[PDB]
């Protein structure tokens, strides 16, 4: 009622990752959310200068499914969010998507996808973030594999201070 639900698919899976802006967000759950497709791609056609690389979005697609984790943030938080997810530079858009528990139990959150983008392979560092959020705050094994099985682009340069020390550790 003061909080909201974050459902969280690409870099936001690492706890590490989304405490940098996000200090104050909680573990709340995993989720899949059925009949969507993980891609990734360059919004606008424009390469991310922080990822060198496509990011995380998804699309509808009977049959696919995306697991994430569900984050506990204040609403006070909701409009730094939208501006991290590049919302007013058309980016990505806020969703709404509900979402099922590994016990069945349905969730509702705020989450973000990209409306005009084009598709392309994720950075070796991204993928690694991604992947260290996957294992970390337990996705399935068989969704973990489907991320490790990503091809990544041959990005052999220098990303965020930050985000290196994330990856070394």
């Not at 990822?51 to 984050?71: C, K, L, Y």
Request: some cysteine; proline content about 4%; overall charge negative.
């Amino acid at each position: 009622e003061e909080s909201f639900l974050y459902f969280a698919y690409g870099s936001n899976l690492l706890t590490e990752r989304i405490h940098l802006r996000n200090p104050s967000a909680a573990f709340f759950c995993v989720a899949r959310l059925q009949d969507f497709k993980l891609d990734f791609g360059n919004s606008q056609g424009k390469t991310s200068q922080t990822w060198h690389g496509g990011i995380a979005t998804i699309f509808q697609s009977p049959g696919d499914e995306v697991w994430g984790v569900v984050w506990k943030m204040n609403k006070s938080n909701l409009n730094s969010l939208d501006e991290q997810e590049g919302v007013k530079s058309g980016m990505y858009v806020v969703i709404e998507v509900k979402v099922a528990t590994q016990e069945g139990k349905e969730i509702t959150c705020r989450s973000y996808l990209m409306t005009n983008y084009e598709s392309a392979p994720p950075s070796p560092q991204y993928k690694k973030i991604i992947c260290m959020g996957a294992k970390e705050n337990g996705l399935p094994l068989e969704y973990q594999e489907k991320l490790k099985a990503i091809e990544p682009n041959d990005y052999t340069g220098k990303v965020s201070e930050e985000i290196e020390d994330i990856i070394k550790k």
